[PDB]
Structure formats: C-alpha cells, structure tokens
C-alpha cells in the first residue's frame, strides 16, 4: 500500500496538482491534504514526498541505505551515473568517499584559501568606487576561485573572459533550472526533448562546462606526476592509473570530468547565490547590518582578516549567516533520492526506483522551531540570552548519505567572506529598504533572488 495522494490522470498524472512556477508550494499544499508522506505521479514517474521535520528526517536518517538513490534529472543526462550529484550508479559510493576524503585533506588550508581569496574580493569591491554595480559577477568570483584552487590549483583574474563565461553558464543554468518550462521538461523529457525551448539552452550549457572541465582534466593527465598531486584533479588521476589493469572500472576519464564538473559548479553557484541573497537581505534590514558591523569592530577590529575562531565569539554574525541560509531555502525541494530496494516507510510500501523527495523548505520553515518562519529574523538562531542557539532543523545542506559534500567549505565560505565584505564596506541600496522584495523570482531546482544592483562605500 502506497502513501496517500491525488488520483492521477492518464499520461499527464498528477500535474494538475502542481504549480510549475512554484512546486514547493504545491508540495506544501498537498502536504495538508494527505499529511507528512504522499504519493505523486508526474509523467509516468512516481514519487514520494516527505514534508516536515519528522517525516523528512525519518527519510534521510533512518532509511539512509534504502533512499540511497538519486532521482534522474534529464537536463543533466550529460552527468548521470557518474561524478557524484547525479550518480545513481554502483560508481557513486567510492568516488564520493574519495573526493570527500580529498576535500578533507585540502581543508586543514581551507581557511587560508578563503582568506587569500577575500583579498581580491575587497580589491574588486573598492574598484567599483561607491558606484552602482551588479554583484552577481563580482562576489561569485570568490567561491569560484576557492574551488578552482582546490580543483585545478588554478587562479582567475576577475576579468578573464572564460572565467566570466563559466560563471554566466552557472547562473544561466541555475536561473533556468528553477523555471517552469524546465520543471516540466524535467518530468516529460522524451516528449519535449526535441521540441524547441530553453531546455536546449540548459543542455548546451551543461555540455560547454563539461567540455571545458574535460579539457582541463586532459591537461592535468598529460602533465601528471603521481608523487606531486598538485590539486584535487590530480588525486583523482592517480586513482585512475593505480588500477588501469583492474578488469572492472571505477574511474574513467569521463567519470573524473563529471566528478570535477560536479564540484566545480557546485562549489561556485550555491555559495555565490547565498552570498548574493545575504547582501540583498542585509540591505532590507539596515539595523541588522549596523548590529553586525558593531560586532566585527568589537571582535575583529577594522584591520585583521576574519578567522574561523572568531565565529565562537560572534553570535549575531553566526546567527545571521544561519538565518540567511534558513530563510532563502536555496534547494527548497532537496535533491531527488531514489528508493534502492523495495521498502516499507511507516505503513507504506515504496517500490524500487521511486523518486523520494525529502523536502527541505518544509523543515526550514517549521513554525514551531522558527516562529514567524516567513520573516527574516536572526533571533531564530539566538536564545533570549543573546548567545548562539543551534537548531536541529537547520538542514539546508540536507543530512544522511547524500548530505551536501561541500558543507564545511560552504559554511566557512559564507561566514568568512561575509565578515570580510562588511568589515570593509557599508551596503547601499538604490531603493528604499522599505521597497526591497526578498521573494525569489524563480522556484524549482533552486530559489532565485531578484536581480539588483548596489553601492559599496569603503570603511578605510
Ligand atoms: C550554499 C551552499 C550549498 C548548499 C545549500 C548545498 C545543498 C546541497 C543539497 C541540498 C544537496 C542534496 C542532498 C541530498 O541529496 O539529500 C547537495 C549535494 C551536493 N553538494 Fe551541495 N550545497 C552547497 C554547496 C556545495 C559546495 C560548496 C559544494 C562543493 C564545494 C557542493 C557539492 C555537493 C555535491 C558534490 C553534492 C552531491 C551529493 C551526493 O553525493 O549525492 N555543494 N548540496
Ligand atoms: O556542464 C555542467 O555540468 C555544469 C552546468 C550546470 C550549472 C548549474 C548550476 C546549478 C546550481 C546548483 C545548486 C544545487 N546544488 C548542487 C549541489 N548542491 C546543491
């Protein structure tokens, strides 16, 4: 017996119960008709959605091994069953475990890297000279580089036409992946794939970044010395040669290229966007900026670069960084899991290959944990005491076996960089803080911020 749900129409399915502009809201809406676990057929594809902290945790922490799979995402057939994110293969487990180990070994190291990078952000920011600018392609360079150094020991100038091109692709794709047409293409790929439409643009872009990353991996291989692995890409290559004789294969050149692409855009566009929501948020609530400045000055001074150990000393900063991520629910629907082996969830049988959706926004907007969850309120992570307060509901990276791999670097990237930009700059909205609308402009894959420009006016 499957989890409850709407009666599915022929072919179409339960797509009338779905608003493509905004799926998560549809989930929320269905959650209140059928409770915490429900069944949806979209296309022929049959999915199970969990809504709310109890249901989502159970899914992600209790049935780790059962909901191990990764639902398919047709935009990314280019990536499927390879790398990590889109790997629903027998390949998945080890190439993840290895990169995760490697990301660890490059991270103790990570602090310095972000710190080094910050230098350039500030430089690029002063250069705007208190004028209006679109930050999308200023602030995004920082995560990009940080990852570029881990990935290819490569550094970019904030004006390399290729660099900017890669960022544009990441933005174009995130943008596009959160719009209706791709939501539908996501679930009816065979019907739509050869019809015209922006699904074609996404594919073209996925292919462009894969090609580029591909070339870099070949460059690496052609020059690889296995004693001196220069970066991540290297560490992978040496595993690829370590077993050229092994009959059955784990690392193929493609395999690596996908793995690398995965962290490349992953490390870049998630943190860039989050940072950009942060900045916009902070311009809505100038009094929070002011409070934050006070702390930076009190605890770090107007000079010394922010460090990880200052976080324990700064609870307003901390909480802000948290609420930023909680409020904006970047991956509001989580990334799609698949049921691996025939499974019993609460009452219900969940067949094999079922797309399991453990919805994050439903966790992040608990109106018990976070009273007025719809409001941006640092207090959500503060206790009446003024110190930091941790929430078990803070899971915008998810949890369990597919927990975001770049979490540590994400977390650090946000706090440090944000810290930096505020330490040296005040934020200027070009519209009244009263007229700033924080609502995403698209909701699918991700939650996407209004385009906006701003001024940064120095503090030294
Ligand atoms: C704002 C920062 C980020 C957020 C909110 C975020 C969120 C997520 C979420 C929700 C998932 C899916 C978890 C699931 O399937 O249950 C995921 C997966 C993943 N993330 Fe992130 N992520 C972020 C940054 C990063 C960064 C910086 C990297 C690389 C440095 C990265 C690499 C990955 C990879 C490789 C996966 C695939 C998970 C798997 O092994 O199946 N992410 N992330
Ligand atoms: O060619 C390619 O493979 C790269 C082009 C795809 C760029 C799309 C960026 C989407 C934003 C990712 C946010 C979701 N996420 C991923 C990992 N953790 C969260």
269 is known to lie in a ligand binding site: yes
Q: At what angle do helices 141-152 and 407-424 cross, to 10 degrees?
A: 140
Distance CA 95, CA 82 (A): 9
CA of 33 to the centre of ligand 1 (A): 30
CATH of segment(s) 1-460: 1.10.630.10
Distance CA 127, CA 37 (A): 52
Ligand 2, residues at Cβ distance < 6 Å: 79, 85, 169-170, 173-174, 177, 205-206, 209-210, 261, 265-266, 269-270, 331, 404, 446
Give SS3 for 13.
strand
Distance CA 223, CA 212 (A): 17
Domain boundaries of the chain, sorted by first residue: 1-460
Q: Does any ligand 1 atom lie closer than 6 A to the CB of residue 276?
A: no
444 is known to lie in a ligand binding site: no
For tokens 């540590």, what's the residue? 408
Distance CA 136, CA 170 (A): 11
Cβ–Cβ under 8 Å, residues 352 and 340:
yes
Mind giving me the DSSP string for 350-419? E-TTPEEEEEHHHHHT-TTTSSSTTS--GGGGB-TTSSB---TT--TT--GGG--TTHHHHHHHHHHHHH
Distance CA 225, CA 159 (A): 31
- Which residue, among 331, 329, 310, 332, has the nearest Cα to 415 in the 3D structure? 310
Residue nearest to atom 25 of ligand 1 (CA): 406
Query: How was this model experimentally determined?
Result: X-ray
> Resolution, rounded to a tenth of an Å?
3.1
- Mutational test site, ligand 1, from 405, 408, 415, 417, max ligand atoms within 8 Å of CB: 405
CA of 302 to the centre of ligand 1 (A): 33
Cβ–Cβ under 8 Å, residues 58 and 348:
no
Q: Does any ligand 1 atom lie closer than 6 A to the CB of residue 410?
A: yes
């Amino acid at each position: 017996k499957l989890p409850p749900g709407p009666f599915p129409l022929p072919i179409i399915g339960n797509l009338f119960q779905l608003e493509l502009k905004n799926i998560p809201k549809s989930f929320t809406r269905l959650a209140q008709r059928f409770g915490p676990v429900f069944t949806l057929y979209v296309g022929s594809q049959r999915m199970v959605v969990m809504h709310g902290y109890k249901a989502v945790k159970e899914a992600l922490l209790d049935y780790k091994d059962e909901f191990s799979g990764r639902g398919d995402l047709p935009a990314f057939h280019a990536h499927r069953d390879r790398g990590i994110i889109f790997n629903n293969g027998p390949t998945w487990k080890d190439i993840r475990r290895f990169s995760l180990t490697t990301l660890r070994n490059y991270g103790m190291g990570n602090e310095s890297r972000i710190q080094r990078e910050a230098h350039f952000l500030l430089e690029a920011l002063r250069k705007t000279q208190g004028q209006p600018f679109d930050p999308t392609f200023l602030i995004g360079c920082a995560p990009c580089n940080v990852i570029a150094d881990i990935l290819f020991r490569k550094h970019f100038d904030y004006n390399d036409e290729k660099f900017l091109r890669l960022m544009y692709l990441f933005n174009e794709n995130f943008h596009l992946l959160s719009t209706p047409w791709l939501q539908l293409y996501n679930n009816f790929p065979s019907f739509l794939h050869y019809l015209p439409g922006s699904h074609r643009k996404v594919i073209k872009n996925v292919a462009e970044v894969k090609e580029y990353v591909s070339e870099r991996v070949k460059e690496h291989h052609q020059s690889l010395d296995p004693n001196c692995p220069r970066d991540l890409t290297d560490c992978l290559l040496v595993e690829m040669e370590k077993e050229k004789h092994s009959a059955e294969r784990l690392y193929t050149m493609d395999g690596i290229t996908v793995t690398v692409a995965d962290l490349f855009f992953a490390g870049t566009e998630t943190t860039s966007t989050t940072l950009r929501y942060g900045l916009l948020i902070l311009m809505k609530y100038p009094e929070i900026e002011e409070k934050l400045h006070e702390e930076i000055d009190r605890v770090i001074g107007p000079s010394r670069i922010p460090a990880i150990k200052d976080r324990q000393e700064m609870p307003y900063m901390d909480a802000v960084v948290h609420e930023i991520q909680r409020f904006i629910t970047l991956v509001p629907s989580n990334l799609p899991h698949e049921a691996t082996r025939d499974t019993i969830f609460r009452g219900y049988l969940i067949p094999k290959g079922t797309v399991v959706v453990p919805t994050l926004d439903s966790v992040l907007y608990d109106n018990q944990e976070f009273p007025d969850p719809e409001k941006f309120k640092p207090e959500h992570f503060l206790n009446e005491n003024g110190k930091f307060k941790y929430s078990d509901y803070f899971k915008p990276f998810s949890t369990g076996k597919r927990v975001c791999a770049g979490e540590g670097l994400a977390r650090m990237e946000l706090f440090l960089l944000l810290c930096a930009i505020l330490q040296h700059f005040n934020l200027k909205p070009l519209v009244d803080p009263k007229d700033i609308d924080l609502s995403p402009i698209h909701i699918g894959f991700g939650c996407i911020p209004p385009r906006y420009k701003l001024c940064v006016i120095p503090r030294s």
